[PDB]
Design an enzyme around this catalytic site. Structure first.
Site, PDB file in Angstrom:
ATOM      1  N   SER A  45     -45.198  -3.630 -24.995  1.00 57.47           N
ATOM      2  CA  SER A  45     -44.084  -2.923 -25.543  1.00 57.47           C
ATOM      3  C   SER A  45     -43.135  -2.349 -24.487  1.00 57.47           C
ATOM      4  O   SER A  45     -42.092  -1.766 -24.826  1.00 57.47           O
ATOM      5  CB  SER A  45     -44.588  -1.805 -26.456  1.00 57.47           C
ATOM      6  OG  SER A  45     -45.325  -2.458 -27.497  1.00 57.47           O
ATOM      7  N   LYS A  48     -39.277  -2.990 -24.593  1.00 63.14           N
ATOM      8  CA  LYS A  48     -38.334  -2.308 -25.470  1.00 63.14           C
ATOM      9  C   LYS A  48     -37.235  -1.553 -24.686  1.00 63.14           C
ATOM     10  O   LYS A  48     -36.112  -1.383 -25.168  1.00 63.14           O
ATOM     11  CB  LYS A  48     -39.035  -1.423 -26.476  1.00 63.14           C
ATOM     12  CG  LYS A  48     -39.921  -2.156 -27.456  1.00 63.14           C
ATOM     13  CD  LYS A  48     -40.811  -1.258 -28.330  1.00 63.14           C
ATOM     14  CE  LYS A  48     -41.685  -2.099 -29.213  1.00 63.14           C
ATOM     15  NZ  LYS A  48     -42.577  -1.272 -29.966  1.00 63.14           N
TER      16      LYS A  48
END
Ligand SMILES: [Cl-]
Ligand SMILES: [Cl-]
Ligand SMILES: [Cl-]
Ligand SMILES: [Cl-]
Ligand SMILES: [Mg+2]
Ligand SMILES: [Mg+2]
Ligand SMILES: [Mg+2]
EC number: 3.5.2.6
Length: 263
Positions: A45, A48
């Site tokens: 992640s 992001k």
């Protein structure tokens, strides 16, 4: 510092997996310390932040508006979507989606942002445009988090992403207003910050983004320093461990604790 390198090695031994590490001086980009800096690891992640960088580039260019309302539906909703599952009927603005993706780790928000820019290939092209030759995004959430053995999809190297984060947060790639908005999102308080925030001393600055995926994938990218001002970028990645999540978090957090201790 050699003390930090020992903690990286201890993490590899305890977790039974590779760990990659880099520290950069924020102002010069000089490499202060490194371990497996050019090996590949899943982004997880941490992508992001790169995504919201791309969004902000489009805002600067007049191709996107932070206030544009994105409407979506129930089957856009994927796991780990704490904000977007609250807005199926009313939608969210682009700025609300970036806040959710970065600060709340909202998967659906990141997927909707990916749509806004035209998908993983367009993020990869933006990265190439700004001089990152290694990082690649191929899939959306949660697929990108699979962490399969021998899979180059959705990977970076510590050195590449450290340099990219430095480009986005400093110098002239983004406008000042955009630079400041990205930092604001990354600095915002989160629900839990085991990797660096939990033990970070009071009054230190930290702008970070962590990620966790499947198959032991874990990562954090950050800009941090004493006295309310960042002065270094640190990137830490691991993948492959089948230790518990708590063990994985603790081993990474000890690397951070050492970085701060021997600053
Ligand atoms: Cl090395
Ligand atoms: Cl290497
Ligand atoms: Cl769109
Ligand atoms: Cl964290
Ligand atoms: Mg609709
Ligand atoms: Mg703030
Ligand atoms: Mg705070």
């Amino acid at each position: 510092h050699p003390e930090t390198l020992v903690k990286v090695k201890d993490a590899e031994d305890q977790l039974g997996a590779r760990v990659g590490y880099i520290e950069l001086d924020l102002n010069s980009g000089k490499i202060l310390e490194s371990f497996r800096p050019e090996e590949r690891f899943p982004l997880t992640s941490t992508f992001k932040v790169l995504l919201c960088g791309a969004v902000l580039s489009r805002v600067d260019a007049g191709q996107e508006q932070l206030g544009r309302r994105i409407h979506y539906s129930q089957n856009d909703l994927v796991e780990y979507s704490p904000v977007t599952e609250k807005h199926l009927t009313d939608g969210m603005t682009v700025r609300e989606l970036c806040s959710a993706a970065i600060t709340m780790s909202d998967n659906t928000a990141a997927n909707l942002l990916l749509t806004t820019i035209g998908g993983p290939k367009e993020l990869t092209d933006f990265l190439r445009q700004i001089g990152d030759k290694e990082t690649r995004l191929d899939r959306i959430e949660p697929d990108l988090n699979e962490g399969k053995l021998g899979d180059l999809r959705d990977t970076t190297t510590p050195k590449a992403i450290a340099s990219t984060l430095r480009k986005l947060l400093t110098g002239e790639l983004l406008t000042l207003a955009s630079r400041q908005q990205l930092i604001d999102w990354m600095e915002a308080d989160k629900v839990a910050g085991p990797l660096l925030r939990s033990a970070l001393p009071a009054g230190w600055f930290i702008a970070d983004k962590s990620g966790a995926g499947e198959r032991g994938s874990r990562g954090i990218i950050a800009a941090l320093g004493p006295d309310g001002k960042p002065s270094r970028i640190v990137v830490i990645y691991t993948t492959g461990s089948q230790a518990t999540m708590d063990e994985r978090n603790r081993q990474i957090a000890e690397i951070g604790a050492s970085l701060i201790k021997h600053w």
